């Protein structure tokens, strides 16, 4: 029961999922052929959430992959695990984005979305009781943004009750991939604040820091960067695919982490992180996981929580561990950091305990954190946004696809109202 339909969008939206479906396949023991060659019995007990059973003891993922060019889709089917997906599900266009939010959401996104909504609606009906959708995309590019937000506008209309969460990638502070990413961010964020129930803001600036400082890798490729994002994604729904002594799910993480239906931008965290030479000397016990999470450098967002305040904190642990050893740590981080949490919400720590660990590591955890630290993130976008808009630079490319200036005002003014809302609860009594 409680099935999930996975959607991808963009070149960044593809390569994360290819790393992500690589991890989920090993968490159950699924070969690169597509059959089953596992060992235990709990691997198959909840297999139906991310898979539909086919005949001949072969299993297929319930995946939907969308891009505006046949290039990135060719790379997925040609690498490892390029045979596991059903070849019908690969939707790909021929026009291409052009790295343009106007072309992604109005001109070419509207023509291809009808070929997507057939495959979306077919996979929703074949499941018994649908739990909700999750989307992996980015905000910088065109196909990840414009084709991405168009689906979320059409998903919520045909399915209002179903939960909807996004593993987007917010662009970094220092380096910047796309010149028109402030226009791409502001137009996409205005859609994310209407049809998404939560958002997992991940920054590549944090990922180059973690793979260099903590993993101690000389030349970290994207396969090492996108490996950690998948471990966070798997760690959210790890209590749904396995039994546990306190079972959480997407809906329990929805209500417990969102106090107000606008404030739904979250930052993740993962633990443990042992390097190659440093793996044997570190004593890997339960309190050692606790002091690794709550610092600044282990967050996957490029903002220190010391500037702001926490609202809600989710903790999803994995492994045979005792509750008292967990509850002692979760109580203790409230007490000495009593300034950093907010006052008018008592007990702002949500605990979730699974049973089965991931592969190799004896135990694990997954951090979800809400904070007012993200107001520096959107203001750094909002300062860069009006700095380009005051000169009307790069404006006619969006305008030439039939887009009015009032769209930019209604996008940007709705952002600063949200920034004021985080400014309100930061200094409330």
């Amino acid at each position: 029961m409680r099935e999930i339909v996975h959607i991808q969008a963009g070149q960044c939206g593809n390569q994360i999922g290819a790393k992500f479906w690589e991890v989920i396949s090993d968490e159950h023991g699924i070969d690169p052929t597509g059959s089953y060659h596992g060992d235990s019995d709990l691997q198959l007990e909840r297999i139906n959430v991310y898979y539909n059973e086919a005949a001949g003891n072969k299993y297929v993922p319930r995946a939907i992959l969308v891009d505006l060019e046949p290039g990135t889709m060719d790379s997925v089917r040609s690498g490892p695990f390029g045979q596991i997906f059903r070849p019908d599900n690969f939707v790909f266009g021929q026009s291409g984005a052009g790295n343009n939010w106007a072309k992604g959401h109005y001109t070419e996104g509207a023509e291809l979305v009808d070929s997507v909504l057939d495959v979306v609606r077919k996979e929703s009906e074949s499941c018994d009781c649908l739990q909700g959708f999750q989307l992996t995309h980015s905000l910088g590019g065109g196909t990840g943004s414009g084709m991405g937000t168009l689906l979320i506008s059409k998903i919520r209309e045909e399915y209002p009750d179903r939960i909807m969460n996004t593993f987007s990638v917010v662009p970094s502070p220092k380096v910047s991939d796309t010149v028109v990413e402030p226009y791409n961010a502001t137009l996409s964020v205005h859609q994310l604040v209407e049809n998404t129930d939560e958002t997992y803001c991940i920054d590549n600036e944090a990922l180059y820091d973690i793979c260099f400082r903590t993993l101690k890798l000389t030349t970290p490729t994207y396969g090492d960067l996108n490996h950690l994002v998948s471990a966070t994604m798997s760690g959210v729904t790890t209590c749904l695919r396995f039994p546990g002594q306190l079972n959480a799910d997407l809906r329990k993480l929805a209500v417990n982490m969102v106090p107000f239906p606008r404030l739904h931008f979250f930052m993740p965290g993962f633990a443990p992180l042992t390097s190659r030479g440093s793996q044997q000397y570190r004593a890997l016990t339960v309190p050692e996981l606790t002091q690794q999470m709550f610092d600044a450098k282990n967050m996957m967002a490029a903002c220190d929580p010391r500037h702001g305040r926490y609202l809600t904190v989710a903790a999803v642990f994995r492994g045979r561990m005792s509750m008292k050893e967990v509850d002692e740590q979760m109580l203790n981080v409230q007490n000495k950091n009593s300034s950093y949490f907010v006052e008018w919400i008592p007990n702002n720590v949500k605990t979730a305990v699974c049973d089965i660990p991931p592969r190799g590591l004896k135990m694990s955890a997954t951090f979800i954190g809400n904070s007012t630290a993200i107001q520096e993130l959107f203001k750094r976008i909002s300062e860069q946004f009006t700095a380009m808009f005051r000169r009307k630079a790069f404006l006619h490319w969006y305008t030439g696809e039939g887009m009015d200036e009032m769209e930019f005002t209604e996008a940007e003014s709705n952002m600063n109202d949200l920034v004021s809302e985080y400014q309100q609860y930061q200094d409330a009594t």
Partner: protein, 432 residues
């Protein structure tokens, strides 16, 4: 299944393209006979038998240099309908390139092109290689680029025009062709790339250690630039780049769309050692004012936008390390309204060596496609050269008697000066 044809106009078109299509046939195991012992679907339409042909068009008004192709090494490689010739040349006239000789064969050129787009399905955009100096590169291109916006329009058109030198001008009346060909291509070509000859002579002397280059040595380093842009089509990379993205990240306003290219590293075979060629080493060689290929000191002006392409074994982390250095240097400054002026491109495959070349088999290479306000200083001298020759009404009578009204100069001067003040608006910073 995405394709991109290329047009080569005149003697500037063909001799650059000869080394270019030489380089493409080496990077796909392509014999010159067309045999070979997917990936290469971009620039080649496969025949039924075991033979490949390029998606190329070579056009010239004078049949001299075309016959090098029909007799040389690359002879059985092209469809002979694609080698359109002529009888008489424009002979450094814009009028003969656009009015007299142009209006008699332009229908045959357009007709072969529309056959090419039908057998393609992933038609992205166009490539036109010519010069501002010669009459064929100025006149015949100006008539051609008008027809494309009539015919296709929405397809992104690129040009590697040979911008004339400040001092080493081979032709005499280059201040007459370069102004009039700009007054046509400004409205139709959304993006064009400038490469000067003179700086390449400075690069070939100072870094290649070759005191005597012919046009061949110039044609090699331009051919690396062409392959470095279309590399994301011919190979899969970690972070791709498309030909529609270049007009997005490099056109801040629809008038000013003239960036300039710089290739790095440029080293010889016996100097291929003695340095480690790291990504941080070569990226400082990109923004160095001596190593550019257009004679415009960028410290005079301001960088509006930059687009870097990396190819080979390129660390994704160290690219983030390299750009973090350059945003801190005081000598390089950006324009006030643009905070984030970079476009990063990563592809796995290295640029190979051409046999008998001079560059060595490096593991990594950069093609810098950046746009600056420093190029406007070159325009002011070229417009000042235009006012000198027009004041005495010299060389005008060759242009009047070939289907051109004399008042067209006074109109085309005003739009050029209108472009001249457009750089002056971008140069100042913000108010308050």
């Amino acid at each position: 299944m995405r394709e991109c044809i290329s047009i080569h106009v005149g003697q500037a078109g063909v001799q650059i393209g000869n080394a270019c299509w030489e380089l493409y046939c080496l990077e796909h195991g392509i014999q010159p006979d067309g045999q070979m012992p997917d990936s290469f679907n971009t620039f080649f339409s496969e025949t039924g038998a075991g033979k490949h042909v390029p998606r190329a068009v070579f056009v010239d008004l004078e049949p001299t240099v075309i016959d090098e192709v029909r007799t040389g090494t690359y002879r059985q490689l092209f469809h002979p309908e694609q080698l359109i010739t002529g009888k008489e040349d424009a002979a450094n006239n814009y009028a003969r390139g656009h009015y007299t000789i142009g209006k008699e064969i332009i229908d045959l050129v357009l007709d072969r092109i529309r056959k090419l787009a039908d057998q393609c399905t992933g038609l992205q955009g166009f490539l036109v290689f010519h010069s501002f100096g010669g009459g064929t590169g100025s006149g015949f291109t100006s008539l051609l680029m008008e027809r494309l916006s009539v015919d296709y329009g929405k397809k992104s058109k690129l040009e590697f025009s040979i911008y004339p030198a400040p001092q080493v001008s081979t032709a005499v009346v280059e201040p007459y062709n370069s102004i009039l060909t700009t007054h046509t291509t400004l409205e139709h070509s959304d993006c064009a790339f400038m490469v000067d000859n003179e700086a390449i002579y400075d690069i070939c002397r100072r870094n290649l250690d070759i005191e005597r280059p012919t046009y061949t040595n110039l044609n090699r380093l331009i051919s690396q630039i062409v392959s470095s842009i279309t590399a994301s089509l011919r190979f899969d990379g970690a972070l791709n780049v498309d030909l529609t993205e270049f007009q997005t990240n490099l056109v801040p306003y629809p008038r000013i769309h003239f960036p300039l290219a710089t290739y790095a590293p440029v080293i010889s075979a016996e100097k291929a050692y003695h340095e480690q060629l790291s990504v941080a080493e070569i990226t400082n060689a990109c923004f160095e004012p001596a190593n550019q290929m257009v004679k415009c000191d960028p410290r005079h002006g301001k960088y509006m936008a930059c687009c870097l392409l990396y190819r080979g074994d390129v660390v994704p982390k160290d690219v983030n390390a390299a750009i973090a250095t350059i945003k801190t240097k005081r000598s390089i400054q950006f324009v006030d309204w643009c905070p984030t002026g970079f476009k990063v491109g990563i592809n796995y495959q290295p640029p190979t060596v051409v046999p008998g070349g001079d560059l060595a088999k490096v593991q990594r290479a950069v093609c810098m496609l950046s746009n600056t306000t420093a190029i406007a200083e070159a325009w002011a001298r070229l417009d000042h050269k235009f006012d000198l020759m027009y004041a005495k009404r010299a060389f005008v009578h060759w242009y009047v008697g070939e289907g051109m009204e004399e008042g067209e100069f006074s109109e085309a001067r005003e739009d050029m000066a209108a472009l001249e003040k457009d750089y002056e608006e971008v140069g100042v910073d913000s108010v308050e």
